[PDB]
Design a protein around this ligand. Structure first.
Ligand SMILES: Nc1nc2c(ncn2[C@@H]2O[C@H](COP(=O)(O)OP(=O)(O)OP(=O)(O)O)[C@@H](O)[C@H]2O)c(=O)[nH]1
Ligand SMILES: Nc1nc2c(ncn2[C@@H]2O[C@H](COP(=O)(O)OP(=O)(O)OP(=O)(O)O)[C@@H](O)[C@H]2O)c(=O)[nH]1
Ligand SMILES: Nc1nc2c(ncn2[C@@H]2O[C@H](COP(=O)(O)OP(=O)(O)O)[C@@H](O)[C@H]2O)c(=O)[nH]1
Ligand SMILES: Nc1nc2c(ncn2[C@@H]2O[C@H](COP(=O)(O)OP(=O)(O)O)[C@@H](O)[C@H]2O)c(=O)[nH]1
Ligand SMILES: [Mg+2]
Ligand SMILES: [Mg+2]
Lengths: 438, 51, 427, 430, 427
C-alpha cells in the first residue's frame, strides 16, 4: 500500500505544512471541516490507499501528519484557523518555550521532553497505516526547533523505523537574504545529523524562490505565504505519482535508487518548470519542450546555485498533465545534446522520467495560474558543494574567536561538538569534489 | 440473558456461504482520477493486511 | 436401520451443533417449525438416522444438549432452527465449570452425569440398532471437555461395541481464548485416546485462514466458522442418509483409516471452497476438486500435511460423478507425490460416492486424513503443558477438586507416548 | 439463575456505588424511582409488581454519606434498611473499625447479607468496595470479609479496592491502615483488583482532557470498569466470561491475586469524531502504560496473565488478530512459564453513556484486568512509608489504646515482607 | 493438445499482456466477459491454447499476473478486457521493487516467488500437454527483471523440456526512462542466456521509429507501441491456434532458428504496417509484404540488419497465399543479398503459411530474425554498464539486499562472451 507520514518541525515546517495541506485538500476535494462532499462519497466506503488521508468512521478524513513545535503561538494559529476541524487535536503538538535559534536547546534541554510525546503519535500513526513508504520531513536548519528537534526526531526514527525512507525537504541559509545571525551555527550542526539519517534531502533556499516570484510572477511584494504556496506545488508534484496514476509511475522508493549514486551524496536541487502568473499564462504556449528547457535554467532552480558550475549526476523529471510519453523523450534528447549543461562522464543515462495524468490544482487566491502541464525537476549536482562551502566559510569566521558559543555551551552541548560538525561538513565537501572528478 | 444480534453477519457476501452462485458480482470504484479498484466492505485488510 | 445419537457439550458444542442441525434439516427438508416440506422422495427414506418420528409429522433431533450454564442453552433455543429440539433433552447444571477441567470432571459434573446418562439411554433403546455416537466439544474449555470426556468414558463402558465420533476443537498455537488450554487439553486427550474410537481434530485459526485466504470473507464471525464445520459434519455421514455408487458407512471409514488402535486422530477439510466473486471462473469438476482437497491450505487443523507422510486418507465425494475418473484421480495423486504417502500401506486412499450433492452445489467432497503431521499440534500443547506444570501454575484450582498431580503426570506421559509413536511411522 | 451481591464499605465505597448503580440503572432502563417502563436479575431483584431493588448494601459507620443516599435522587430505588449507618466512624483507625466500633454493626450487616443470599437462587460472588486508606474501609472491611468467608465457604470474593498513591494522598495514617488491610485481604479476598487515585487522576487529565476533575468524574469511569467485568452475565456474547471464569483464568497462585486494571477507549466528545476507533487501536491503547488505572510501570514488571473484556461491535478475528500483534510486541513481556496467557471475552452490548458524563459514545470498548509482577512496586512504596513511621513508633498510641496490641503491627509487616519475596520468586525466570 | 501458459511481470509486462490479451481474445471471438460470440467455427477449434473452459461457457485465460507494486493489479482489471483474468492469478506484492534488480530477485522475491509458483503449478497441472511457457517483461526495471528472471530460473528446473518464450524490452540507445537501466539489463540478460530457450528482443525507440514513420501516427499513445508488440505475440502462435498449409509449432520455429544453444536472442518485425491515409492505395501482396519484411526500419530492434549478417531467419505468413509464390520470394531475397546472409548455412529462411489471417487484414506476416547485428545492442548496454560499475555508482542499493560485486563482474563475463560469440560468425 502507498502511504507517507508527513512531519513538520519548526516555524517554517508549520507554515509550509499549512500551505501543503491546503493544496492536498483541494487535490482530493476534502472540505476544510474534514468531510468530503456527499456526491463524492456515494461510492465505496472502502479507502484502499490514500497517501495523505485516513478514513475515520463515516466520511471523515484526518491528515496523517503531526505538527510539532516548541513555540505554542504558531501551532495555535492552526488550532484557531479555518483548518481547525481538519487536523486531529492531539496530532498538533505545542510546547512551553521555543528553542530560540539554539541547536543546543532544541536537541538537549527543551527538545528532549517533547520528543517522547512526538514519538507516541508517530507510533499511533504507524500501526494505523498498512503500507508505509516513507516519512516526509519539513524544517528549516536556520532555526533552533528545525535544527535541534529535527536532529533529535530523525535520530529516533532511524532506530525505531529501520530501512524506511525519510525524505526531508529542508530550508538552508541563503547567501544574502537571511534573517538570523546564528544561522551558520545551526545549519552546520544540522548537517552532522541530516547527512546519515535522512535518505534524500531536497535543498530549498529562501532568496532563490524570492527571485522566482519577482521575475516569473512579477510580484514585487512577496511574503512567506507566496513562497510556501509553490513550495507546496513542488511537494505535490513530487508525490503525484502515488495518489494518481500515469504512463510511467515513480514511487518514493523509485527516487532513491535512481537519484543518489552514493550513500553520503543525497542532497538534491529542485525545479518547477511552468511558474506563470495569471495574465501571462494565456498568451504563452506551455509546450513540453518549452517547459523542459525552462526547468534546467539556472533562474528556475529553487536553490541559489549555478548548475553550470557543477555537473549533473542524475535528473528526475516529474511530468504532470497531458504529456504523451515521447515529447518528454523528444525533450530529453534536446536537453542532453545541449552543451551548456554538463552530465558527468560515468552516468550515460541520467534522466528519470515520470508522468502523471492530472494537472496541478490551483489554490484559490493563489498566485500561480492553471496550466495543463507541469515538470518538477529534482537533480543531483556537484554544484550543491557551492552551497555547503559557503556555509562552511561563514561558520569558520565566527568560530575563529568563538562568537555565540556561550549560548550553546551552557544549554547542554560541549565545545568539541562544534568541531565535529565542522569536520563532517569539510569531509562532505571533498566528497562532492571527488565524485565530480573525471 | 438479553438477546443481541451478532454484529459479524452484516457482510453481504456472508449471507449465503457454501452455496454455488456464479452470478454474484463484484463492483469497482474510482476516487477522483485515482486508481479504479475493487469494492468490498473491508478490502484493505484483504489487500495488504495491516501494520 | 442405522442411527446416530448426537451429543453436544459446552458453549462451543452447543453452538457448533446448532448450525449442524441447521444444515442437516435443510438438507433433509425439515422446516424451522419441524414438519417436512421437501420435494424429493430420497430425503424422507432415510431420516431415522438423525430424527425421531413424533405426532403430526414432527421430527425431533437425536441431540442431547448438555452443559453447566443455562446461558448457552437459551441462546441455542432462541436462534433459528432451535425450536426443533426436545426440551426434555436440554440437560444442564447451574454453577458452571468456568473452564476448570477438574470441576467439570469430578466436582460439578458428577451430579449431572447421572442426569445426562438418563437421557442418552432414553435415546438409545428407543431406536433399533445404533451405528455409533457423535459428540462435538472442545479441549480448551472445562464444561465440554471435563464433563464431555466423563460422558464418553461412561458411554464406552455402557455400550462398548458402537462407534464414537468426536469433533474436538483443539488449542491454537498463535492465539488463545483462555489461559488453561494446555491443562485441559492434555487431560482431555488422555481420556480421549482410550475412550474415543476415532477423532476429528478442528482448530479455529485454520478455519480462520480458510475463510480469509480462500473464501475472501473479510469479517467472518463464529457464525460461519461453524457453517464450515457443519458441512464437514454432514460430509461424514452422507453415505448413511443418501445412497451412492460406492457406499462406505462409519464403520468402513473406521476400519480403513485406523491402522493401529491409537492411530485414531485425523484432520479434516471441506473441498469446494471458492470466494464469491470467483465462482464464475472456477469450473466444478472432479480434477479441480482434488487439487483443492489435497491442498495444505484446505486442512482445518493447525497441522501442515506437507511435514508428515500420510498414513491413510479417505475422500467422501458427493454428487453426480464417474467412478472410472475418480479412481484414476486418486491413483494419480498417489503417484505424483509418492514421498508424502507412507510406503508399507499400498492404496492409502479409500474413496466413496454419494449421488445426492449438498444443497447449493452440484458436487462436493470431504477429506479425512490420518497423517503423522498431527504430532505437531499435540506436541506444542505438550510443550505448553510442561511449561506451566513444572512451576505448578494454575494448579491449586485443579487440585482443590480432588485431582492431585498424579493424573497430570499420567496425562503428560500418555501425551508424550502418543507423539512418540507418530514419529515412529514418519521415519 | 445467576445473581451477584455487591457490598460497599467506607466513604469511597458508597460514592463509587452511588456511581455504579446509576450506570446499572441506565443500562437496564431502570428509572430512578425503581420502575422499568429478564437481564436485570443479575443486579436487581424483581419486587412485587413492576418494581426492582438493587442487590446491594450500603454500610458505613459515618452517617453523613449514607444520609446523602437517603435524601438523594435514588431514595425510592434502594431498600431503606440496606442503607446501613453507624453512630460514628472509625476515623482513620483500623483498630477502631475492626475491634471496638466495628463489632456493633458487623452483626447487622451479616444478617442482611443472609437475607439477600436467601432471595437469590445461585450466588456467584461478592463484590466489595472499600478504600484501605480509611478506618472503616480497612477495619470494617477486614471484619466483614473475615466473617463472610466462614459463613459462605468456597464462594468467590471479588475485591475492588483503592490503595494510596505514592504522591497523592489525603491522610497521614494511610500507610498504617493499608498494611493491616493487606493482611486480611490476602487470604479472605479471592481476587483483588487494585485501584489508584493518582493514576485515574492522570487518565482524566490526558485522555478526557479535563483540567479540574473531582471524585465524581473518577467514580463515573470506575463504574465503566465494574460494569464491563460483569457484562457477560447481564448480556449475551460470543465468549462469555463469568465471575468464576475470572478466578481460575487470572490467579495462578493462591497468595498472588492482586491485579491491575485498564479501560481502553477514554475519549471525549470532540475527540470521538477525529479518532478512528477500531479493535486494533483499543487493544494497543489497553496495554499502554498511561492507560493503567493503578500508578505503576508494567514495563518494569512481567505480565503473568491477562484478561480482555470486549464490549460492543467486535468480531472474533480482530480480537484474535490484535492479540497476535500484542504478543509480538517487545516493549511488553510475558513470563516464560505461561506461554498461553490471553483470556478474551466478547460481549455484544455496547457501553452506555451517562448524561452529563465525559466519556463519549463508542461502538467498542476493552476492559483489561491483568496480573503482573509490577504490582510489587505498589507494595514496596507502602512498605517504605509504613516502615518509616513505625521506625520510632509514631501514630501508634491511637491503635494500641483501642484494643489492638503492639505486636499486631509487626506480624502484618512480616505478611507484606513475605509478599514481596513471593512476587520476585514467581517473577524469576526458570 | 498443445497449450501455452502466459506469465506477465512488472508494469511493462502487465500492460503488454493486457494489450496482448486484448488482441488475441477478439480474434477467437471471446468478449470481455468470456462468452464466445465469433462468426466462424474455426475459432472454437483451438481455444485450449490460451483459454480454459469453465462453467456457463466462460473462457478464462491461462495468464499469471505478477508484480511487486499493487497499483498495476488495479491497472489490469479496470482496463478493457480486464475481467477475463482469474482473480486467484492476481498475485502481487505490497512494496514494489522500485527499479532495483536486487529487490526483485533477492529480497522481495522470496516472499512472492513461492506464491507465483503455486499458481503456475496449478495451471500447468490443469493442462494436458504443455507446448511451452511464454513470459513478457522488461529488462529496464526491477519488478519484471529481477523477479521475472527469478521465475524463469525456477521454472526451468521444474519443467526442463518445455519451451520458454520471453518478450523482453531492453534499454534504449537514444532516450531512456530509468537511470539504473544498464544495471538491470546486464544482470537480467546474464540470467536469460542459460535458461530461456528462445528470446525476443524489443525496445520502445525502435517502435517509436515504426509508429512515427511507417504508421505515421502524429501523437502515438503509449499503448500504441503495445499494439505492435501484441500483434507479434499473436503472430508467433498463429500456426498453433489455426490450421495452415505448412504446420510450424513453437518447436519447429525453435529448432530452425538457433544453430547453437547460446544464440537464442532474436529480433522481430511485423510486416503489414501502413498508415490509414494510404491503406486504400496499398495492394497487399506477397512481394509487398516481403519488401516491407526485410526493411531495416520495420524491425522492432535498434540493431541495423545491414551491419551484421543474418544468421538464420524465419517468416510466419497468415492468410490465403501460394506456396510457390512464398518460396520463390524467400529465395529471391537470399540471392539478391547474399552478403547479408551467412555462407555455411544454406536455406536460411524457413517460412510457414497459416490460412487464417488476423482481424481486419486479408494477409499478414510476422518476421523473426536471428542475426549477429544484435551484438551492437548488447555492446551498447554493456558500454553503459562499464562506465557506472568502474566507480561503483548506484551500487550501494544493489549490494543492500544481499548480492556482492562478484555477481556484477560475472554479469559482464557472460555479456561480453555473448557479444564475442556473436562476433565470430560475422567475419
Ligand atoms: N519558506 C519559508 N521559510 C521560512 C518561513 N518561516 C521561516 N522560514 C525560514 O526559517 C528561518 C527562521 O528560523 P526558523 O527555522 O523559522 O526557526 P524555528 O524552526 O521556529 O526555530 P526556533 O525559532 O528556535 O523555534 C528564516 O531564515 C527563513 O528562511 C516560511 O514561512 N516559509
Ligand atoms: N475514587 C474515590 N476514592 C475516594 C473517594 N472518597 C475517598 N476516597 C479515597 O479514600 C481515602 C480515605 O479513606 P476512606 O476509607 O474513604 O475513609 P472513610 O471511608 O471515611 O473511613 P472513616 O473515616 O472511618 O469513615 C482517600 O485517601 C481517597 O483516596 C471517592 O469518592 N472516590
Ligand atoms: N468452532 C467454534 N469454536 C468456538 C466457538 N465459541 C468458542 N469456541 C472455542 O471454544 C474455546 C473456549 O471454550 P469454552 O467455550 O469456554 O468451553 P466450554 O466451557 O466447554 O463451553 C475457544 O478456544 C474457542 O476457540 C464457536 O462458536 N465455534
Ligand atoms: N512498449 C512498452 N513499454 C513499456 C510499457 N510499460 C513500461 N514500459 C517501459 O518499461 C521501462 C521501465 O519499466 P519498469 O516500469 O521500470 O518495469 P518494472 O519496474 O520492473 O515493473 C520504461 O522505459 C518504459 O518505456 C508498455 O506498456 N509498453
Ligand atoms: Mg521558532
Ligand atoms: Mg468516613
Amino acid at each position: 500500500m502507498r502511504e507517507v507520514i508527513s512531519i513538520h518541525i519548526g516555524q517554517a515546517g508549520i507554515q509550509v505544512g499549512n500551505a501543503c495541506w491546503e493544496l492536498y485538500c483541494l487535490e482530493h476535494g476534502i472540505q476544510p471541516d474534514g468531510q468530503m462532499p456527499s456526491d463524492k462519497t456515494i461510492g465505496g466506503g472502502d479507502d484502499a490507499f490514500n497517501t495523505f488521508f485516513s478514513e475515520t468512521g463515516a466520511g471523515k478524513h484526518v491528515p496523517r501528519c503531526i505538527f510539532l513545535d516548541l513555540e505554542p503561538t504558531v501551532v495555535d494559529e492552526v488550532r484557531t484557523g479555518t483548518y481547525r476541524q481538519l487536523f486531529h487535536p492531539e496530532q498538533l503538538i505545542s510546547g512551553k518555550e521555543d528553542a530560540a535559534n539554539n541547536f543546543a536547546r532544541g536537541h538537549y534541554t527543551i527538545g528532549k521532553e517533547i520528543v517522547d510525546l512526538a514519538l507516541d503519535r508517530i507510533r499511533k500513526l504507524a500501526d494505523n497505516c498498512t503500507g508505509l513508504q516513507g516519512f516526509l520531513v519539513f524544517n528549516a536548519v536556520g532555526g533552533g526547533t528545525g535544527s535541534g528537534l529535527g536532529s533529535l526526531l530523525l535520530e529516533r526514527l532511524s532506530v525505531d523505523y529501520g530501512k524506511k525512507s525519510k525524505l526531508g525537504f529542508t530550508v538552508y541559509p541563503s547567501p544574502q537574504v537571511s534573517t538570523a545571525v546564528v544561522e551558520p551555527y545551526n545549519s552546520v550542526l544540522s548537517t552532522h545529523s541530516l547527512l546519515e539519517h535522512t535518505d534524500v534531502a531536497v535543498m530549498l533556499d529562501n532568496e532563490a524562490i524570492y527571485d522566482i516570484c519577482r521575475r516569473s510572477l512579477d510580484i514585487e511584494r512577496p511574503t512567506y505565504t507566496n513562497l510556501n504556496r509553490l513550495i507546496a506545488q513542488v511537494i505535490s508534484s513530487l508525490t503525484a505519482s502515488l495518489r494518481f496514476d500515469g504512463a510511467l509511475n515513480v514511487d518514493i522508493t523509485e527516487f532513491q535508487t535512481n537519484l543518489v549514486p552514493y550513500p553520503r551524496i543525497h542532497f538534491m536541487l529542485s525545479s518547477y518548470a511552468p511558474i506563470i502568473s495569471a495574465e501571462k499564462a494565456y498568451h504563452e504556449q506551455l509546450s513540453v519542450a518549452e517547459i523542459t528547457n525552462a526547468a534546467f535554467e539556472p533562474a528556475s532552480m529553487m536553490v541559489k546555485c549555478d548548475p553550470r558550475h557543477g555537473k549533473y549526476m542524475a535528473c528526475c523529471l516529474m511530468y504532470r498533465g497531458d504529456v504523451v510519453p515521447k515529447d518528454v523523450n523528444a525533450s530529453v534528447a534536446t536537453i542532453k545534446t545541449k552543451r551548456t549543461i554538463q552530465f558527468v562522464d560515468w552516468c550515460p543515462t541520467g534522466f528519470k522520467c515520470g508522468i502523471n495524468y492530472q494537472p496541478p490544482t490551483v489554490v484559490p487566491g493563489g498566485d500561480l495560474a492553471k496550466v495543463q502541464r507541469a515538470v518538477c525537476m529534482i537533480s543531483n549536482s556537484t554544484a550543491i558543494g557551492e552551497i555547503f562551502s559557503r556555509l562552511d566559510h561563514k561558520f569558520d569566521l565566527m568560530y575563529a574567536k568563538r562568537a555565540f558559543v556561550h549560548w550553546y555551551v551552557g544549554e547542554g552541548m560541549e565545545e568539541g561538538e562544534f568541531s565535529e560538525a565542522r569536520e563532517d561538513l569539510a569531509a562532505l565537501e571533498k566528497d562532492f569534489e571527488e565524485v565530480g572528478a573525471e | 440473558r438479553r438477546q443481541l444480534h451478532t454484529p459479524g453477519d452484516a457482510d453481504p457476501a456472508k449471507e449465503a456461504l457454501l452455496t454455488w452462485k456464479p452470478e454474484m458480482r463484484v463492483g469497482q470504484f474510482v476516487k477522483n482520477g485515482g486508481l479504479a479498484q475493487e469494492n468490498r466492505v473491508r478490502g484493505h485488510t484483504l489487500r495488504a493486511t495491516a501494520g | 436401520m442405522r442411527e446416530i445419537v448426537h451429543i453436544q457439550g459446552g458453549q462451543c458444542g452447543n453452538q457448533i451443533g446448532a448450525k449442524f442441525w441447521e444444515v442437516v434439516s435443510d438438507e433433509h427438508g425439515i422446516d424451522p417449525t419441524g414438519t417436512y416440506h421437501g420435494d424429493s422422495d430420497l430425503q424422507l427414506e432415510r431420516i431415522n438416522v438423525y430424527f425421531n418420528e413424533a405426532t403430526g409429522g414432527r421430527y425431533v433431533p437425536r441431540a442431547i444438549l448438555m452443559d453447566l450454564e443455562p446461558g448457552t442453552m437459551d441462546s441455542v433455543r432462541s436462534g433459528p432452527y432451535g425450536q426443533i429440539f426436545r426440551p426434555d433433552n436440554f440437560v444442564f447444571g447451574q454453577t458452571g465449570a468456568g473452564n476448570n477441567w477438574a470441576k467439570g470432571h469430578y466436582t460439578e459434573g458428577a451430579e449431572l452425569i447421572d442426569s445426562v446418562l438418563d437421557v442418552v439411554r432414553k435415546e438409545a433403546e428407543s431406536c433399533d440398532c445404533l451405528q455409533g455416537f457423535q459428540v462435538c466439544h472442545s479441549l480448551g474449555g472445562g464444561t465440554g471437555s471435563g464433563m464431555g470426556t466423563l460422558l464418553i468414558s461412561k458411554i464406552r463402558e455402557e455400550y462398548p461395541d458402537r462407534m464414537m465420533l468426536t469433533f474436538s476443537v483443539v488449542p491454537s498455537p498463535k492465539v488463545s481464548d483462555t489461559v488453561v488450554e494446555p491443562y485441559n487439553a492434555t487431560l482431555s486427550v488422555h481420556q480421549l485416546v482410550e475412550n474415543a474410537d476415532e477423532c476429528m481434530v478442528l482448530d479455529n485459526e485454520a478455519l480462520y485462514d480458510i475463510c480469509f485466504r480462500t473464501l475472501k470473507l473479510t469479517t467472518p464471525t463464529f457464525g460461519d466458522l461453524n457453517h464450515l464445520i457443519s458441512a464437514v459434519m454432514s460430509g461424514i455421514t452422507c453415505c448413511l442418509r443418501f445412497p451412492g455408487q460406492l457406499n462406505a458407512d462409519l464403520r468402513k471409514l473406521a476400519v480403513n483409516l485406523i491402522p493401529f488402535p491409537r492411530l485414531h486422530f485425523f484432520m479434516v477439510g471441506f473441498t469446494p471452497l471458492t470466494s464469491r466473486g470467483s465462482q464464475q471462473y472456477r469450473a466444478l469438476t472432479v480434477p479441480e476438486l482434488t487439487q483443492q482437497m489435497w491442498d495444505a491450505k484446505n486442512m482445518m487443523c493447525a497441522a501442515d500435511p506437507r511435514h508428515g507422510r500420510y498414513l491413510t486418507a479417505s475422500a467422501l465425494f458427493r454428487g453426480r460423478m464417474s467412478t472410472k475418473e475418480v479412481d484414476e484421480q486418486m491413483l494419480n495423486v498417489q503417484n505424483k507425490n509418492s514421498s508424502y504417502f507412507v510406503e508399507w500401506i499400498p492404496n492409502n486412499v479409500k474413496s466413496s460416492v454419494c449421488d445426492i450433492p449438498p444443497k447449493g452445489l452440484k458436487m462436493s467432497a470431504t477429506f479425512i486424513g490420518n497423517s503423522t503431521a498431527i504430532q505437531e499440534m499435540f506436541k506444542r500443547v505438550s510443550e505448553q503443558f510442561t511449561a506451566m506444570f513444572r512451576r505448578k501454575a494454575f494448579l491449586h484450582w485443579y487440585t482443590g477438586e480432588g485431582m492431585d498431580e498424579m493424573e497430570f503426570t499420567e496425562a503428560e506421559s500418555n501425551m508424550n507416548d502418543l507423539v512418540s509413536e507418530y514419529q515412529q511411522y514418519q521415519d
